[PDB]
């Protein structure tokens, strides 16, 4: 299970990278921290914590038109 | 609490003089240690006022060494007819270790004034 969590996180930070988020600094800091952490996790819970506490970072952006991708 | 060195330094007589050529064949008293390299020599003992050179056959007797001497150390031994002046030359540039063990064996052998 959780193994997919680590994976999804790798994909995800790669996305936030290529969306040119590193023009900020403090962003790149908080993100790279969340990454470097779950990639040492131990229990699905606090993982999912840091997971959403990241993801929302992306959500606050407006490069993604998720109303599309949620086409299923 | 830390004793230095029980000795075995021998003493012979041989040749020394004031210059390279002035060394007569019998006038000096060598103190030495036969180490890995022949009768390796340490110090000279004499009665003459000055001797700045010495000459000793090699390990096998090829040539004669031209080993200069120190500004000799002054002291007086005793012979049954009173005090007697003696000098202790060292082979120049001889560090404190062998100077020390030579003084050890020597002052052991000869009681001074």
């Amino acid at each position: 299970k959780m193994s997919d969590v680590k994976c999804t996180s790798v994909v995800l930070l790669s996305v936030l990278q290529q969306l040119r988020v590193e023009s900020s600094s403090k962003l790149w800091a908080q993100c790279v921290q969340l990454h470097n952490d779950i990639l040492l996790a131990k229990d699905t819970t606090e993982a999912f914590e840091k997971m959403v506490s990241l993801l929302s970072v992306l959500l606050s952006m407006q490069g993604a038109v998720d109303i599309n991708k949620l086409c299923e | 609490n830390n004793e230095l060195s029980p000795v075995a330094l021998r003493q012979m007589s041989c040749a020394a003089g004031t210059t390279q050529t002035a060394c007569t064949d019998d006038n000096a008293l060598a103190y030495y240690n036969t180490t890995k390299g022949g009768r390796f020599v340490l110090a000279l003992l004499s009665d003459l006022q000055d001797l700045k050179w010495a000459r000793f056959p090699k390990s096998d007797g090829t040539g004669t060494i031209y080993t200069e001497l120190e500004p000799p150390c002054r002291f007086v031994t005793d012979t049954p007819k009173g005090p007697k002046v003696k000098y202790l030359y060292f082979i120049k540039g001889l560090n404190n270790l062998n100077r020390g063990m030579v003084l050890g064996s020597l002052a052991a052998t000869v009681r001074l004034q």
Binding site: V10, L40 | L4, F75, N96, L97, G104, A107, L112
Partner: protein, 794 residues
Amino acid sequence: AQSFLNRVCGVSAARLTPCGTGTSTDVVYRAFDIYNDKVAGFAKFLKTNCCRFQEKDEDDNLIDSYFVVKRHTFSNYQHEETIYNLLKDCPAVAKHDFFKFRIDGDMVPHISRQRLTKYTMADLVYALRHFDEGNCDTLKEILVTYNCCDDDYFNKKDWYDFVENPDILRVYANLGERVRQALLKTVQFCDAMRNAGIVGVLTLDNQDLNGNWYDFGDFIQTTPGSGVPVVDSYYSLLMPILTLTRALTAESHVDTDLTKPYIKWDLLKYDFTEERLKLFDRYFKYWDQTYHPNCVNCLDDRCILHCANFNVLFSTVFPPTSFGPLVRKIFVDGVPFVVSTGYHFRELGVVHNQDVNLHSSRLSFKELLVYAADPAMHAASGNLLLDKRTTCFSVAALTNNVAFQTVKPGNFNKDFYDFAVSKGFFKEGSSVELKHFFFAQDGNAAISDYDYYRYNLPTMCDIRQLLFVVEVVDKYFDCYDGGCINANQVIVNNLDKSAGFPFNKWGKARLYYDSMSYEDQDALFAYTKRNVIPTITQMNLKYAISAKNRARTVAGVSICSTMTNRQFHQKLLKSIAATRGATVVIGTSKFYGGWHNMLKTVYSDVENPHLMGWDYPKCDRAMPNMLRIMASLVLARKHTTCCSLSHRFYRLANECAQVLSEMVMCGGSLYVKPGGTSSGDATTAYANSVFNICQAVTANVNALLSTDGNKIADKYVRNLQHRLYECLYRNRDVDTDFVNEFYAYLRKHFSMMILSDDAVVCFNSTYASQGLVASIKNFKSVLYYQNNVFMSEA
């Protein structure tokens, strides 16, 4: 009983309190330096010919002073007497007092050493070299005794560390001054013991911890004005403490006084010599082989070691600006330039170029190159910088805005993973589970890493046992061959890598290895055998799988270094790389059962075999300099014909300027690299291996001597150890018989396989338990006292 106790309170401070027993002696576990005719070593015996009184204080508190009364032979009683009576003057003498007292019907003599100190310099130096946190207490009790720190500190675990809790340094530092005090008194002592004309040797376990002396036994008489001491056990043991505790720091103040501020050497004074030599003549006076500051004047390298130490000490008193290149202004056809005409290392004194030339019109490719890589031109024209993120002494800037680094994530490979789960993998509770990943790194990655050189200290490494185990290590390398070569014989692989800086603004090494004849390269080479070429360096961030989220760096070196060090070492480097069946095993495939062969070698009949490895905690930052020079020297040893002398010496100098301590273009700016190696030059994995062997040997030497004397059974090995000590301190020059003997002894009971900084040792078990082969605890001790980090036993 008391009349005695009374009668040894002599005349002073009658406040005594025998922490002994009654009128019997005492039993103390004290760590001597001993060498009779039969035993030898630096080891912790049980001594008992002494009655011991703890002098108390008004208000009837205890107080660190002692009356130690010894009882021995009448004859010896006289010797000690007449000697003491000759020498009751030079204040470094603990004020003795003799007497005759009766025990029963026995008129036993007694000597009364007055006001000493519970310990001696021995217990210090010993229980600091042979540390072991499981039971280091005497360290605890000293450090609180001299107010270095209050007891509470010690329960905060990781108080002994270094990579951790590095504030520990200051604690040790608090002691330093008092050590210095000792030195001075001893010199006074030596002078007296000369002019009064005495002979004997000074040993540590005659030294109350303040400074006085006492145990005057074995000295013997002589003419006055001609007395000799023997100071080569003393210093040569005291050496490395002398820059743990920094016993020289009270020498930069306005008058060697802790109160006053500092001297201020005028910014321009780079020379500094009669200083160096004066310090030496005030402290290490009675040393017994000449010292000649500028190492240029040294002879066969071994004199270069015996003066590179004293410089690595006297150079923590001078200021850290006047170290480094020495520029000067020249004229390229009537055009002002600034170029580095010399250098001024922290050890190798002053060094001056030898083919320098002002006023030149048109300058060719060679010197053009050698000018674009000197930092003189670069930093002489740049914005002054000041950085508050490191401590490494910054120097200059270049741009007008620093650059920030980042290390992107890795990218996924979904399918293979989807496959993987489809084959029933990663199903929870598996015993295989992802563990290595592409960690990501934020902004200030580099400098927040390059900071680590602050883990690197100066050090003085004991000089005698070093001047020996360099010889044994040398013996490990008598089956190869090397020397200078020529252009058409170097061999480059993947001639397409980086080219440092600034040459990387123009392309890879294709150009520079291409845009030059062979004669070009030979002019270069046979040039640097008489000059110096300070260089730069870049730091790079690695980007590859890992398991620990730290950073990584690799020092990309500038082309004018490799392009010579190759030519100078290639023959050897091959000769090692391609030989099968030896100690160093760089370059032997693990395919086609070559691995199995490696093992069935490094076994090879050692009787009772156990296997042990280890690992070096932060290996390439914390390696002190002395050991790096030792590596470079052992490699160059085989160059005895191609080279000469001054050729070598300048070649060593060029290397020590190009890899040891030169500027580091980290980020967008220039710093200094105070020490430590640099994992990117031409001669690493080899040099790391050599250093490693040096550690393993030194550990075994200590493990031998450290052992007691009279429990060794094999009379042969006892006579070994004894002979070893003799060859090591008493002697001056090599005992090839003995060295071959030793090397064989090791190959028989301590065989070892080495990759660059990665070992395996197969060793003779019951020996270990008998301590005649360095089991682990000795590794703790060595990594401590001369790599000053702490190698955990996990």
